[PDB]
From a paper:
To investigate the conformational changes at the active site of SrLDC, we determined its crystal structure in the apo-form with a C2 space group at 2.9 Å resolution. Unlike the two crystal forms described above, the structure contains a dimer in an asymmetric unit. Interestingly, two SrLDC monomers in the asymmetric unit exhibit completely different conformations at the active site, although no cofactor or substrate is bound in either monomer. In one monomer, the PS-loop is in the open-conformation and the R-loop is disordered. In contrast, the other monomer contains both the PS-loop and the R-loop in the closed-conformation observed in the structure of SrLDC complexed with PLP/cadaverine. Moreover, the entire AS-loop is in an ordered-conformation with a clear electron density map in this region. These observations indicate that the open-closed conformation of SrLDC is caused mainly by the different crystal packings rather than by the binding of the PLP cofactor and/or the lysine substrate. In fact, the PS-loop, the R-loop, and the AS-loop all show a much higher b-factor compared with the rest of the protein, indicating that these loop regions are highly flexible. Taken together, the results allow us to conclude that the active site of SrLDC has an extremely high flexibility.
Residue numbers in the entry:
A (entry chain B): 1 to 139, 151 to 222, 225 to 381
B (entry chain A): 2 to 382
The structure:
Amino acid sequence: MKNFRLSEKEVKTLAKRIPTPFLVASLDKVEENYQFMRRHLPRAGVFYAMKANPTPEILSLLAGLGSHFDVASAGEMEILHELGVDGSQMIYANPVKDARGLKAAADYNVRRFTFDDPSEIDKMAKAVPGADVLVRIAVKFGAPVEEALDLLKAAQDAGLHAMGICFHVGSQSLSTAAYEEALLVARRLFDEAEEMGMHLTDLDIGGGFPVAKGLNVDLAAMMEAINKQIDRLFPDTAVWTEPGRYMCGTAVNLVTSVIGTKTRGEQPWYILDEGIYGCFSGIMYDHWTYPLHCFGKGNKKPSTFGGPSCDGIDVLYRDFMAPELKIGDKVLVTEMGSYTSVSATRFNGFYLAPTIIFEDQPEYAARL
Amino acid sequence: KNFRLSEKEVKTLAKRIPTPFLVASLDKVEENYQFMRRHLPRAGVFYAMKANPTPEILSLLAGLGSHFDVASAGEMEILHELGVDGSQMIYANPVKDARGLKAAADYNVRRFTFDDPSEIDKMAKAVPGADVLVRIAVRNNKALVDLNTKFGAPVEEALDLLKAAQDAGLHAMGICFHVGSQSLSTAAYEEALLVARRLFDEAEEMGMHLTDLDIGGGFPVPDAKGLNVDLAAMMEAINKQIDRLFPDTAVWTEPGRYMCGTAVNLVTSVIGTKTRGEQPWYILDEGIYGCFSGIMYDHWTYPLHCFGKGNKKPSTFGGPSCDGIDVLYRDFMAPELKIGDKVLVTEMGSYTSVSATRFNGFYLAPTIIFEDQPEYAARLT
């Protein structure tokens, strides 16, 4: 498992014929990440958290491979529908659902819906009578385990089908022991519910998986421990996972050029043609950090990179060791797949940087 | 006074239009523009369209005779579509991009700003003979001379730059400066204006005759805690100064926040409730990824109005992402609200929707012209 990276020569040839900034996504890498999870965690169907990356080619690839989808809004389920994706392969997993979104959900025939609060029941019962609902469980957001069953019975009472439960394990706190303890709590709640008159049939595990193999744990071995725990505890139940960052994050790169240089201070400044109102919006909204590769040879000094807009805050990196760069030189930013261009804007009238598909280019064929 | 929708009005607008939407009063954009012609006559207006690019606003302004401060090819293209000639534009981004400079070339935009030598040859090659103004660092409204910022040459290198640009075939037209956002006092201008006199006076003796001076923006708008500047008084102190120091030169300003800020309102619905915490929690259908993005990007607090009586408890408001960052207000005194009730945010005109996104696939809240709605007619009556 390698992260998707473009070589220096690939960045130059691509930039010759696509004007910067642009993103480059690798469908091959997305597939690899999909097949990895399937190989090591076979018992979880995949609900793709498309909020992370909603690019149509990535989305089509995923429907091709069998992925279901995790929809947050009417506009998400609209994009999917034009690609031929049915609402039976959608779960509406926004906790608080818009009216416009519940309408969409009825029209498209979305099967599964999730909730943590009893104010949410009152409105799904009117909008989508008899819909299959899962409760989100905190083991902020989520619902106390001890209120989980009362919440499904309230749902069942208003004419919704109590179908099951989701938790989310945080990446920071991610461990095999953690998933194993949540599955135990889930198993108890199933058994308890059954004696309560409800047959729960579906269990949604969340995402919160990381990566590329240059990172902390042995994830293949971890998914196999979780998978073995699903097979012993939930051999008849439909199990799901909803990866988002996991699917895409290391599957996209940004190519962007130096459009100005400021040489006045001790520190050189370099203005790029993408910034915090475009793809680097991740910095503000995801609190994330993107590896930056400048390509000159020569001596390095501490250097600031700025974005292209009239705002003070359009600064991406400071005291970053980089060589001497000219205008028109190209830099490359990896880990640009998730929660980046989702947050981009046309602030200052600027265009959204397009996403180019790597497999539809000579450079991809050239890898041989 | 500021454009503020009645409660009566929020209710009927919400009947006909789905939340969230914004509501622009073109009358108010016109008062604002006129107020500035009345009290700061000597200052020609380059509307900074980044604050609000709404097409009906822009056309109003074009019709009143305003010029435009243009920041990218996309902002030029919109103006060209509305019939606005390039003579009406200044490309006032100090670091310009190739698509921008070709657009500028195509649409014959006359003016450009710059604060560095690496910009010059990029402009000479792309529009020869263009009028340039050098952008210059000055004491900000905070009283700092910050030379480590994104924009502005030091006063010390201002004239050489301008000469360096004349040496590349560009017309050395003048000087601009920006004191920054939300000026609560007139000190930064009077002080900066005087620094500018000196460079013209020093340039006369070099033999470059500078014809134009752009004084930037920074004019205030009320926020969550109001505004206590006397704008008329502030504007006349600046005007007064431009007449003693610059009797014989063309003087321009670049308002953005001021022009539209007080002309726009957001109508948004409470869509969920959380009652497990000690504070009640209200989820609205606009978030930090939408128009409230100005919390993140502009460090700004908007003034919120809930309607109802008989309660007030400190309450929390969050956005529709349902995210850790998607929190709008905490400890806000609000009555008991229910799903379906409408809230109002006022002074939502500037640096608001421009930074909004389709994250989660939500829509960009549309911007409704109030003068076309039936609620306006009621007003004239």
